Amino acid sequence: SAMEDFVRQCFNPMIVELAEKAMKEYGEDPKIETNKFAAICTHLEVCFMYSDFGEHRFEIIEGRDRIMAWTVVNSICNTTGVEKPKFLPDLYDYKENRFIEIGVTRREVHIYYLEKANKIKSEKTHIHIFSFTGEEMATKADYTLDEESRARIKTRLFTIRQEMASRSLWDSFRQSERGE
Ligand SMILES: O=c1cc(Br)[nH]c(-c2nnn[nH]2)c1O
Ligand SMILES: [Mn+2]
Ligand SMILES: [Mn+2]
Numbered sequence: 001s002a003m004e005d006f007v008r009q010c011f012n013p014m015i016v017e018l019a020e021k022a023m024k025e026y027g028e029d030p031k032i033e034t035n036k037f038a039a040i041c042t043h044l045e046v047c048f049m050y051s052d053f054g055e056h057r058f059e060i061i062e063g064r065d066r067i068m069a070w071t072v073v074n075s076i077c078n079t080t081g082v083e084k085p086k087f088l089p090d091l092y093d094y095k096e097n098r099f100i101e102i103g104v105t106r107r108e109v110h111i112y113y114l115e116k117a118n119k120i121k122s123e124k125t126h127i128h129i130f131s132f133t134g135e136e137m138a139t140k141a142d143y144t145l146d147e148e149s150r151a152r153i154k155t156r157l158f159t160i161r162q163e164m165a166s167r168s169l170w171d172s173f174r175q176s177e178r179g180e
Pocket of ligand 3: 090
């Protein structure tokens with residue numbers, strides 16, 4: 001375990017349960033694919049923190065069953081006309097009226113930005129990338145959040161990294177490119 005112990009100690013139970021459900025759907029064992037497990041929890045938590053930093057500004061799409069995620073996406077499209085994305089995004093921004101894809105990477109933010117923009121191939125979805133180094137990259141350099149909220153996300157990601165490092169897990173996690 002070790003990685004599993006750390007995941008259960010640093011993420012709240014709701015997130016852990018959501019991550020285990022995601023992995024039981026994919027067919028993957030969180031006791032085996034430990035680095036994926038941690039990356040899923042981290043990404044889930046960034047999405048929830050992002051949303052929570054809003055007069056009810058964000059709708060969370062990530063973390064729901066696919067049925068219900070698509071139900072939410074469809075509802076938003078029918079009530080705004082916003083083009084329906086091709087891949088499930090992570091949040092909807094009602095203030096700006098755009099979907100958001102959140103990326104968390106152990107590599108350089110620009111590399112992973114390029115990789116996500118190339119994947120989603122949709123000019124509609126705003127993209128926001130975070131590293132474990134306090135760096136971010138976002139479409140048009142439009143970061144959406146205020147400094148406080150982005151700083152809190154940066155802090156938590158760095159803290160997770162240092163917690164992994166103190167437990168000797170960071171090097172495997174960093175080289176694992178799995179989940180990001
Ligand atoms: O950032 C992400 C990385 C991976 Br790998 N997958 C997703 C995803 N999968 N289904 N909905 N979102 C992300 O948002
Ligand atoms: Mn997602
Ligand atoms: Mn994402």
